[PDB]
């Protein structure tokens, strides 16, 4: 028997043309290979609306959403996948990352813990918000690294752990190691960039983001993160240009905002600081075109 309603906690997009298609899962996967995340997410939403028992659909949706700068929706989707397959280690890794971003410390540590101990190769094994949980995660990961040295994902996972406690120096070293081992992994470069940025190294962060974008040119979270690093260095032309790219790509260019509404408000702050009150007035309407044109990304 089919089940249609283990999905009522997810705010599905209303007018989803993928609901009319024959194989939206296949199409979502194709859109991912194209790096069209907003579009990928809509196709996976269709699958989760029709077949909410398909774990792979929730996993793909979750992964796509966090890449499209929507951690809250990522966590909702991923929790479904986690219920339908508690050994899907990609779901646990992703939950750790999105919870770290959301500053859910207990959930992040629990996700790193499940990530490790769900793998048969490792199952034998003052941070104020969750002190002994953090120490146990550190210990597990270090024990794992002595059984499997030079593992990129253990080093990445230590990176996430150390981001949680603001030990950006140790996080950077570990993620640096992980990208040396896997230099075509866009997420790893992004993770290293965010770590450097959060540790007051934006110039180095931007080098990592460029590598991430050269790998995955539709990686909207990297685009956002570049806006952030540029803004942190007061380079507002560069910030503005990347932020406009991010907004456009996040919504899927030609196509329920919220994630978008704070990016627009952030963009307003940039336009204000650069002394452009005409441009500021335009942000209220939340149309990309004026800014795409003003900032050299499109036409005229």
């Amino acid at each position: 028997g089919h089940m249609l309603q283990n999905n009522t906690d997810y705010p599905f997009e209303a007018n989803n043309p993928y609901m009319y298609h024959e194989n939206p899962m296949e199409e979502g996967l194709s859109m991912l290979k194209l790096a069209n995340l907003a579009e990928a997410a809509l196709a996976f939403e269709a699958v989760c609306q029709a077949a909410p028992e398909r774990e792979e659909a929730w996993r793909s949706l979750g992964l796509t959403q966090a890449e499209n700068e929507k951690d809250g929706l990522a966590i909702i989707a991923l929790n479904h996948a986690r219920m339908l397959d508690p050994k899907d280690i990609a779901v646990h890794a992703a939950l750790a990352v999105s919870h770290t971003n959301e500053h859910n410390a207990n959930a992040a540590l629990a996700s790193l813990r499940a990530w490790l101990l769900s793998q048969p190769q490792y199952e034998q094994l003052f941070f104020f918000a969750a002190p002994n949980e953090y120490r146990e995660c550190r210990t597990l990961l270090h024990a794992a690294l002595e059984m499997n040295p030079n593992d990129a994902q253990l080093h990445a996972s230590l990176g996430v752990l150390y981001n949680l406690s603001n030990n950006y120096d140790s996080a950077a070293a570990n993620l640096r190691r992980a990208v040396e081992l896997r230099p075509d992994d866009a997420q790893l470069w992004n993770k290293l960039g965010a770590t450097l940025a959060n540790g007051n190294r934006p110039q180095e962060a931007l080098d990592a983001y460029n590598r991430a974008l050269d790998i995955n040119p539709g990686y909207v979270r990297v685009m956002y993160n570049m806006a952030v690093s540029y803004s942190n260095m007061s380079q507002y032309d560069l910030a503005a240009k990347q932020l406009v790219r991010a907004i456009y790509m996040q919504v899927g260019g030609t196509t329920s905002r919220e994630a978008t509404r704070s990016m627009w408000d952030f963009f307003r702050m940039l336009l204000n600081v650069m002394n452009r009150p005409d441009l500021v007035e335009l942000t209220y309407a939340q149309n990309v075109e004026p800014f795409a044109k003003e900032f050299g990304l499109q036409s005229m």
């Binding site: 700068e69 971003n101 965010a194 940025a197 959060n198 956002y224 993160n225 952030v228």
Partner: peptide, 6 residues
């Protein structure tokens, strides 16, 4: 400064 995301 503003926060970056993993």
């Amino acid at each position: 400064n503003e926060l970056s995301h993993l």
